[PDB]
Structure formats: structure tokens, C-alpha cells
Design a protein around this ligand. Sequence first.
Ligand code: FES
Length: 104
Amino acid sequence: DKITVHFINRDGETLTTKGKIGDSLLDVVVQNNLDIDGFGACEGTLACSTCHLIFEQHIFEKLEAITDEENDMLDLAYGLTDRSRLGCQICLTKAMDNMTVRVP
Ligand code: FES
């Protein structure tokens, strides 16, 4: 199944695209060639902070439990919020249809 995801880019523009249930948010950016500068540098291997996304609170609270490995890297991210995750760790579910995520 596919869902719609909106990305607010760091230039304030919204990029709307579709992703498949089970794909990571990095897969969504890559597969759809979204023009988000520098996003996903390390290719989803927890060796960068560049796939950092800011979530809506209601989505964030139902995401999978964060690992220490993700958290340690995420701690170093520019514009870290209490609703932040590394996007390459987050896989799409139907709860996320029409959600908005933001790139700081
Ligand atoms: S793409 Fe590097 S940790 Fe997510």
C-alpha cells in the first residue's frame, strides 16, 4: 500500500510524495529524488545526522522505541527537538498517511 507524505524542506517549501508501507523515510526521499540538500549522507547506517526529521507530536509518540545508537547520533543533530528522529530508522505505517515531517 502507498501513503502520502509531506516534507517541509529547510527552504520552507513543501514537497509532497508517496511512499510504500514499510519503506524508511530515507527510502522515500531517495526513491522519489526529493531535493533535500545533503539528506541521507550515510545511506541509513547510523553514521550521520543528516536524515534528521521533525515529526508532528501525535505521530512521534507512536514511533518505534529509539535505540541508544540512534539517540547518541541524534543528540548531535542541528535543530534537535523533542519530536526528532533519524528518518532512515523510521518505517512507514498507515498511521502516517498525510503526515508532515520537517527538515531543519
Ligand atoms: S542516513 Fe545517516 S543515520 Fe540516517
